[PDB]
Amino acid sequence: GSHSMRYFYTAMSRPGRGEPRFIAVGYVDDTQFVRFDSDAASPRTEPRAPWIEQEGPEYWDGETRNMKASAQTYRENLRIALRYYNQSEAGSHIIQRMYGCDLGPDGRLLRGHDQSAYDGKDYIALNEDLSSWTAADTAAQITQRKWEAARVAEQLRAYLEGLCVEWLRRYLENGKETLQRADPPKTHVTHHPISDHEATLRCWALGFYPAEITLTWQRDGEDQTQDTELVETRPAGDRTFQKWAAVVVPSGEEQRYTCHVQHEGLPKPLTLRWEPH
Amino acid sequence: QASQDVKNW
Amino acid sequence: IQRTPKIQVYSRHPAENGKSNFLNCYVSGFHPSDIEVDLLKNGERIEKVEHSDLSFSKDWSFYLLYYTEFTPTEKDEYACRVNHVTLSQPKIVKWDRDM
């Protein structure tokens, strides 16, 4: 239903080990489709999903030229940040940027995003109006003024409302088999004794796409959020995801506990119980 | 398709 | 400034002894991006280990997946070793097929 495209840039200075390294990856929803590494032999934007390979030589050459220029822009940005923060040339620092567009269920732009960070902290963000900026600190206000003066936001708004939505819609169509056909989780409950008087019930969801999912444990139809251990959703490596939720149960009460799975690939939310063999 | 960086920090 | 990595070690599919599978070590929530990740078989480094392209979450913290093909057995012990600026010593997480 809802879809999004995002690009993630990481630029890191490496004093005494090499020139600054720049990495860019692009995602449609939870599927990576391009990458660029300034450290690779002969840096090029490379495909990372089958459906992007259909693009012509000018696409790959155009992306590669843009990424090379961006890597050079962020080299400069790292030097500029050293000024604003009065930092030495000896340490390694990181600039990050993430930007892209969100489409609502109708396939039209729902929201645009553009955020930058310095050393892991918010630096500057384009506001939801796509016309003004939010600076996290006084250094970022220096950048904010330069970007207002150079009409940066108008150019980014044009990209986010235009080419971003326009290329995302094209990628979704070209990759509809995998991008628009959700995989429901395969689910089961496992039981692990802790002692003769207690056990862990673990609710598993495997092989699902996209990554969004809800796993909850209920006791007598009551939710047990405080007593549920949730691991973060993790990639299986084949473009699907995994998650589990666990609860510690007194022996003899196992059948009062139900696991509830909500995932867009499922017609109705599943309800599961320990089904001992 | 990626945006083109417009301007410096 | 510095965030220590979370670590999960797991197989792509439910492990069955003697059946070919993939061993995964997923490291996430860490900052800065420099990190050491190794997959171990019986405490020794597994040769051909591949990893995903560096990306990050909404909160700016990085994540990476390291993986290799493997066949689980009764005898062999598998683990993931992670070193980061936040850690004084490499922390080793053993593979538990129940997780």
Cα C94 to the chain's mean position, in Å? 9
> How far C12 CA sits from the closest chain A CA (Å)?
5
Tokens matching residue A242? 């995994």
Largest Cα–Cα distance of chain B, in whole Å? 22
Query: Could you give the number of structural domains in chain C?
Result: 1
* Structural domain containing residue C67: 1-99
The CATH number given to whatever domain includes residue C66 is: 2.60.40.10
* Structural domain containing residue A196: 182-272
Beta strands in A84-240 (DSSP E): 94-103, 109-118, 121-126, 133-135, 186-193, 198-208, 214-219, 222-223, 229-230, 234-235
In angstroms, the CA C66 to CA C23 distance is 8
Q: What is the resolution of this structure in A?
A: 2.1
The CATH number given to whatever domain includes residue A39 is: 3.30.500.10
> How far A26 CA sits from the closest chain C CA (Å)?
9
A206 found inside a domain: yes
In angstroms, the CA A214 to CA C39 distance is 30
Which of A128, A149, A181 terminates a domain? The answer is: A181
Residues A173, A166: contact at Cβ < 8 Å?
no
A49 and A16, same structural domain? yes
A249 and A173, same structural domain? no
Single out the residue of A233, A167, A208 nearest to residue A3, CA to CA: A167
A141 found inside a domain: yes
A19 and A6, same structural domain? yes
Q: Is A111 on the interface with C (CB under 8 A)?
A: no
Residues A128, A160: contact at Cβ < 8 Å?
no
A94 found inside a domain: yes
In angstroms, the CA A139 to CA C94 distance is 44
A277 found inside a domain: no
- Nearest neighbour of A76 by CB, restricted to B1, B2, B8: B8
Say whether C52 and A235 touch across the interface (CB within 8 A): yes
Q: Which residues of C touch A244 (CB under 8 A)?
A: 99
Cα A231 to the chain's mean position, in Å? 17
In angstroms, the CA A81 to CA A13 distance is 11
Q: Is A212 on the interface with C (CB under 8 A)?
A: no
Task: Give me the residue label for tokens 């119980």.
Answer: A273
- Nearest neighbour of A152 by CB, restricted to B1, B2, B7: B7
Which residues between 1 and 9 in chain B have a beta carbon less than 8 angstroms from any beta carbon of chain A?
1-9
A209 found inside a domain: yes
Task: Report which secondary-structure segment, H or E, holds A53.
Answer: none
Residues A233, A242: contact at Cβ < 8 Å?
yes
Say whether A66 and B4 touch across the interface (CB within 8 A): yes
A264 and A211, same structural domain? yes
Q: Is A54 on the interface with B (CB under 8 A)?
A: no
Residues A166, A152: contact at Cβ < 8 Å?
no
> In chain A, after which residues is the C-to-N distance over 2.5 Å, breaking the chain?
none
A175 and A187, same structural domain? no
